[PDB]
Amino acid sequence: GFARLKRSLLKTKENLGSGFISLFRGKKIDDDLFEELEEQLLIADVGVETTRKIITNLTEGASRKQLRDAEALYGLLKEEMGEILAKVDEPLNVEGKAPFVILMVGVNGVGKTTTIGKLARQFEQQGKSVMLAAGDTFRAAAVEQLQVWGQRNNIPVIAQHTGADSASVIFDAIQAAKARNIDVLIADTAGRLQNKSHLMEELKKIVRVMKKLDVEAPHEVMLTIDASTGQNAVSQAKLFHEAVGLTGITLTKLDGTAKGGVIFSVADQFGIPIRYIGVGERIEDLRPFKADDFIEALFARED
Ligand SMILES: Nc1nc2c(ncn2[C@@H]2O[C@H](COP(=O)(O)OP(=O)(O)NP(=O)(O)O)[C@@H](O)[C@H]2O)c(=O)[nH]1
Ligand SMILES: [N+]
Ligand SMILES: [N+]
Ligand SMILES: [N+]
Ligand SMILES: [N+]
Ligand SMILES: [N+]
């Protein structure tokens, strides 16, 4: 089973899941084993704190059951790491709002704009009308690229002149979405980390201004982070979550990176639903995150 996701996770499986099998083969459970496993979890970008929790719980579980052979730790690890991901398995539901507003936050270069387009096309295939807001207002090339994409896909894009107030652009986009019976409004935002506190104030202003039109907006504050950036994804998530409060995460570029284990650090550190994982270039390769599929793909040795 899960042959496709196993292929997407091939490089990550070298260290996690089925990658554990060679580590445990023929070994006893002792402090040396747990030191080796800790090292491998850290190399896989699971993170110092999440790795410490896993090791602590495995040690107690192995001792409680008086396990002898390292091979038995495999199933315990599958349970511990599977529970981490199951706690953030909650798909995004965009139904029933006029419009449902998604505020897309994150730094530049991690897949935010790509994810906006994939989400927009997915919602359209579901029968929904979509509109985009070009709220990254000081990056003229990025605004223009979003407008070009919208024109190519017959999806309206609300934009103002270079340097416009992002909260004003997004307010106008909500007004336009309401006026034109739009089902989903996806708002792009700036992603410059230079002087990060200014960006966070910009995002908080966007959120405050939305409430004049709909106290429920934004219905989703979605972070986009890039698994190939390792623990940078975790520090980005902490920055945005402490600043504005996330309600969902998209983790991109899981295909081909050996750093996919960062998903456990993101899940455990914040407890925010992971809505989507990116595993390729097609629209359909932005996949709703399913924790069981993910853990089975990672830990299975068959194909
Ligand atoms: N291999 C892979 N690449 C992805 C995935 N999602 C996004 N990307 C790629 O990552 C790059 C960054 O995409 P983009 O959306 O342009 O990034 P951004 O966060 O808006 N800012 P910038 O314009 O600097 O890129 C693009 O080349 C994109 O095609 C994914 O899921 N897998
Ligand atoms: N950590
Ligand atoms: N939905
Ligand atoms: N300017
Ligand atoms: N405001
Ligand atoms: N691959």
Curated annotation (Swiss-Prot):
GO terms for molecular function: ATP hydrolysis activity; GTP binding; GTPase activity; protein homodimerization activity; signal recognition particle binding. It comes from the Bacteria. Proteolytically cleaved. The cleavage may regulate function and subcellular location of FtsY. Full-length FtsY is found primarily associated with the membrane, while cleaved protein is predominantly present in the cytoplasm. One of its GO terms (cellular component) is cytoplasmic side of plasma membrane. It is a peripheral membrane protein. Its EC number is 3.6.5.4. It is an enzyme of class 3 (hydrolase). It is found in: Cell inner membrane; Cytoplasm. It catalyses: GTP + H2O = GDP + phosphate + H(+). The keyword Hydrolase applies. GO terms for biological process: protein targeting; SRP-dependent cotranslational protein targeting to membrane; stringent response. Keywords: Cell inner membrane, Cell membrane, Cytoplasm, GTP-binding, Hydrolase, Membrane, Nucleotide-binding, Receptor. GTP binds at residues 106-113, 188-192, 252-255. Conformation of the Ffh-FtsY complex and regulation of its GTPase activity are modulated by the 4.5S RNA. Formation of the FfH-FtsY complex leads to a mutual stimulation of both GTPases. The keyword Cell membrane applies. Disruption phenotype: Deletion affects both cell morphology and protein export. Mutants are defective in the insertion into the cytoplasmic membrane of three topologically distinct membrane proteins, MalF, AcrB and FtsQ. Its main location: membrane. Part of the signal recognition particle protein translocation system, which is composed of SRP and FtsY. SRP is a ribonucleoprotein composed of Ffh and a 4.5S RNA molecule. Binds to SecY. Contains an acidic N-terminal A domain, a central N domain and a C-terminal GTPase G domain that can bind and hydrolyze GTP. Contains at least two lipid-binding sites. The first site contains the first 14 amino acids (helix 1) and the second binding site is an amphipathic alpha-helix located at the interface between the A- and the N-domain (helix 2). Involved in targeting and insertion of nascent membrane proteins into the cytoplasmic membrane. Acts as a receptor for the complex formed by the signal recognition particle (SRP) and the ribosome-nascent chain (RNC). Interaction with SRP-RNC leads to the transfer of the RNC complex to the Sec translocase for insertion into the membrane, the hydrolysis of GTP by both Ffh and FtsY, and the dissociation of the SRP-FtsY complex into the individual components. Belongs to the GTP-binding SRP family. FtsY subfamily. This is Signal recognition particle receptor FtsY. It comes from Escherichia coli (strain K12).
